[PDB]
């Protein structure tokens, strides 16, 4: 064999290349099905959705029949007629790259939409009693006396005139009709600096937004209780955080000319999280919709007693009929989940006068108590999801609900549960701390809906749509393959045959109608881009379990296979570790016989993430293919730790992060290198971002033999610097894993790095709030004093993201030039 050398292009030339391949370049989302209720009309439903180059509410008409010779192309009608810190941070937390309207709220009975475009909060009406428009609607600005920006606006389900929002970390409730506005929480003074003012109501802490993808801390109660005179009592449940005790970090201010730092709260691993607790506002109203009064209530006992051991409010909300408010609750180590009903009778008014408090406590019965309706444990971890469905209350002594759990089988499946709401043994009157089991409820039934060596999908907007009429439950899953996410359906009363609805060979992300008679699917594969098509469901007269599917219309046709993009082929191997580890291979374009090629290995292979599966890798992973075309082999492997393959697989690196990963990357690279005589193993490079950059550094530290060069992007060089929500989940408290932390921290092992230059390259966003720049700066400090070289590049306008276009152009240009000059080209192998 003979080595192939890629073409030495100049910096200016490589920029022309990357400029021109870029020269030609998001689908719709947040669908909602609203019935037209037109006896005489052609259309059954009307769908609404957000689409993009701005991002606005569209609608499209759904016809009762279709011509089955032709493809109905659904036409897009626009519903709408034409940065703060609180936004730009949230946009980082939500990982939302594109500007416009990120989401919206809607009230069924009225028709009221509610959404936040720019600084403004707006509302429009369509779909309700007030009809269906045939032209764009002009957005109604919700007006305010609030100085700063307003976040997280939500329609009250009970009265759609009222809305709430956050303002300077406090809750407010403007009325879209009376224009009455009121501050419901007086917890945080907007003027007083953060160092001495850390309380905040209705908001999700940094950790809950970053690590538990929960972006809100208040939940409107769906029903309104009537008053004697004629008004009504609304309710908002909220989380009151006190971040007083949490660490204060300094991250560089984006305005580099100021040369100052923003102080924000970062629960470093092993330190304390904020002092969370529950609370509830009782908004009293008269018949006129005027606010009579607002009583603000608190738990009858501390949160540390009633929810003993709870360190996180992962999710929360209300039961369908507003009777109890519920809450999903993790212990600190995140191995013990709970599901706790919380009666509004637990909350009593706040009182300064000491003997009025005393009185109010005794008016509350002993029988009122937190009802823990489910508890689960594990020796790996809970993965929080959005799945939870509570059925209406059949019997007043019980609560039927569906939930998902990895904890039973080792894989995530659906379980129907009836819990019995027992009067708790514990009686507050006697005065004492409840026993470890005093609030637990008996489980009457627990019927596993699904089961097997595959998982149901709950993260990232996958959920369940439950048909409470036919008594079915729809769900995405990995049953047909780990590489394809498909829609399924099954009875929740007589569990049995699961029925796949989506077509084989693709990876779908469905959004089933609230009426369960339709479902949309954004699908693609390795070859084709992502079409979005509508599909109609049908029960045969003789058998409601059997749902059959028929293509109805196309919402968005695919572009078609991109010209000048050879996709990769999706390989596997039997691992020495007893698993079928999957990988992706970009063969170099226009291969030569008898010539070995320089190999680049892209990587992430960390938790919550699969890279290797059947989807179009032309959008985001475009350059992997541009690389290949220039003459690099490109490999991608999902080491043990990747998602969508069960808990025990994901758990393999627990307490052990960075120690098992490269073993699999090399394993697959060697399995490949035997079969593929064109793979030059002497010239392997590696590169990734975040956990990717972490492993790239590990790769070079451990396996100088396999990897010639490593390019680490915003890497974790030190676990004592990351946050609680993540590191404790996967590595635990630093005292309970003294040795895993040290082995998993590359900056502690700086002397292990290679004394050859032109091998380590560090990239980092300088304003990185998440993976703080310190990680790089301290790695460098210890490198400097261990006497090892590095090449560094900083992206000063950036965070845990690349958002400025010219910053991303530079990253790409440089990485290619670096790869050329130190791996691929003939001058690179000369240097050695």
């Amino acid at each position: 064999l003979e080595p192939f050398y890629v073409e030495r292009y100049s910096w200016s030339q490589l920029k022309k290349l990357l400029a021109d391949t870029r020269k030609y370049h998001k689908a719709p989302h947040d669908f909602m099905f609203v019935k037209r209720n037109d006896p005489d009309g052609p259309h059954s439903d009307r769908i609404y959705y957000l689409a993009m180059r701005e991002n606005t509410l569209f609608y499209s008409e759904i016809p009762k029949t279709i011509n089955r010779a032709a493809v109905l192309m659904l036409s897009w009608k626009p519903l709408l007629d034409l940065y703060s810190r609180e936004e730009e941070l949230l946009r980082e937390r939500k990982r939302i790259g594109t500007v416009g309207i990120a989401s919206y709220d809607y009230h069924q009975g009225s028709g009221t939409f509610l959404f936040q475009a720019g600084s403004g909060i707006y509302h429009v009406k369509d779909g309700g009693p007030q009809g269906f428009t045939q032209q764009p609607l002009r957005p109604n600005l919700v007006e305010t006396s609030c100085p700063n920006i307003r976040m997280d606006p939500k329609l009250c389900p009970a009265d759609p005139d009222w809305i709430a929002f956050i303002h300077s970390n406090d809750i407010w409730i403007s009325n879209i009709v009376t224009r009455e506005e009121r501050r419901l929480t007086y917890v945080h003074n907007e003027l007083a600096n953060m160092e001495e003012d850390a309380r905040s109501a209705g908001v999700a802490t940094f950790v809950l937004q970053e690590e538990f993808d929960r972006y809100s801390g208040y939940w409107w109660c769906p029903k309104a209780e009537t008053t004697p005179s004629g008004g009504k009592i609304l309710r908002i449940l909220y989380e009151e955080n006190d971040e007083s005790e949490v660490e204060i970090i300094h991250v560089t201010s984006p305005m580099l000319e100021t040369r100052r730092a923003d102080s924000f709260r970062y629960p470093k691993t092993g330190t304390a999280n904020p002092k969370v607790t529950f609370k509830m506002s009782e908004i009293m109203i008269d018949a006129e919709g005027r606010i009579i009064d607002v009583i603000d209530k608190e738990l009858i006992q501390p949160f540390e007693i009633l929810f003993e051991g709870v360190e996180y409010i992962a999710r929360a909300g209300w039961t369908p009929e507003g009777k109890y408010a519920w809450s999903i609750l993790l212990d600190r180590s995140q191995t013990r989940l709970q599901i706790v009903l919380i009666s509004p009778e637990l909350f009593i008014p706040v009182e300064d006068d000491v003997m009025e408090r005393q009185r109010l406590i005794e008016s509350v019965p002993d029988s009122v108590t937190p009802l823990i309706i489910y508890e689960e444990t594990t020796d790996i971890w809970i993965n929080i999801h959005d799945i939870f469905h509570v059925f209406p209350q059949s019997h007043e002594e019980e609560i039927e609900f569906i939930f998902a759990s990895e904890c039973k089988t080792g894989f995530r499946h659906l379980y129907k549960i009836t819990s019995i709401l027992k009067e708790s043994k514990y009686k507050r009157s006697s005065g004492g701390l409840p026993a470890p089991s005093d609030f637990k409820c008996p489980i009457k039934e627990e019927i596993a809906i699904t089961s097997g060596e595959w998982e149901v999908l709950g993260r990232h907007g996958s959920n369940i749509q439950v048909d409470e009429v036919r008594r079915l439950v729809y769900f995405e899953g990995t049953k047909d393959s780990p590489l394809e996410h498909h829609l399924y359906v099954v009875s929740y009363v007589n569990p049995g045959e699961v029925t796949r609805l989506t077509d084989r060979g693709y990876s779908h992300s469905c959004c089933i109608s609230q009426h369960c008679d339709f479902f949309i699917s954004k699908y693609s594969n390795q070859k084709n881009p992502h079409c979005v098509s509508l599909y109609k469901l049908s029960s045969p007269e003789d058998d409601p379990t059997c749902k059959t599917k028929e293509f109805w219309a196309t919402i968005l046709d695919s572009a078609g296979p991109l010209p000048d993009y050879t996709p990769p082929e999706i390989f596997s191997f039997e691992s020495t570790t007893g698993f079928t580890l999957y990988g992706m291979l970009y063969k170099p374009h226009d291969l030569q016989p008898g010539k070995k090629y320089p190999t680049v290995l892209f990587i992430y292979g960390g938790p919550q993430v699969q890279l290797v599966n059947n989807r179009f890798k032309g959008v985001k992973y475009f350059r992997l293919n541009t690389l290949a075309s220039l003459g690099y082999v490109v490999v991608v492997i999902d080491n043990r730790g990747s998602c969508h393959r069960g808990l025990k697989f994901e758990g393999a690196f627990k307490y052990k992060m960075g120690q098992i990963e490269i073993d699999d990357q090399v394993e697959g690279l060697q399995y490949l290198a035997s079969r593929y005589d064109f793979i030059d193993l002497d010239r392997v490079g590696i590169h990734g971002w975040s956990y990717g950059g972490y492993l790239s550094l590990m790769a070079l530290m451990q396996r100088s033999d396999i990897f010639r060069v490593a390019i680490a992007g915003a890497p974790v060089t030190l676990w004592i610097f990351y946050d609680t929500g993540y590191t404790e989940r996967y590595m635990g408290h630093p005292d309970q894993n003294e040795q895993g932390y040290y082995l998993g921290s590359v900056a502690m092992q700086a002397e292990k790095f290679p004394s050859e230059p032109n091998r380590l390259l560090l990239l980092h966003g300088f304003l990185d709030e998440n993976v703080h720049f310190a990680h790089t700066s301290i790695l460098l400090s210890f490198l400097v004093r261990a006497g090892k070289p590095y090449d560094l590049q900083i992206y000063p306008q950036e965070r845990h993201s690349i958002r400025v276009p010219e910053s991303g152009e530079h990253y790409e240009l440089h990485l290619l030039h670096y790869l050329q000059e130190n791996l691929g080209s003939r001058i690179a192998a000369l240097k050695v």
Partner: peptide, 8 residues
Amino acid sequence: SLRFLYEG
């Protein structure tokens, strides 16, 4: 997460 956001 430990998860960046670039979109080329």
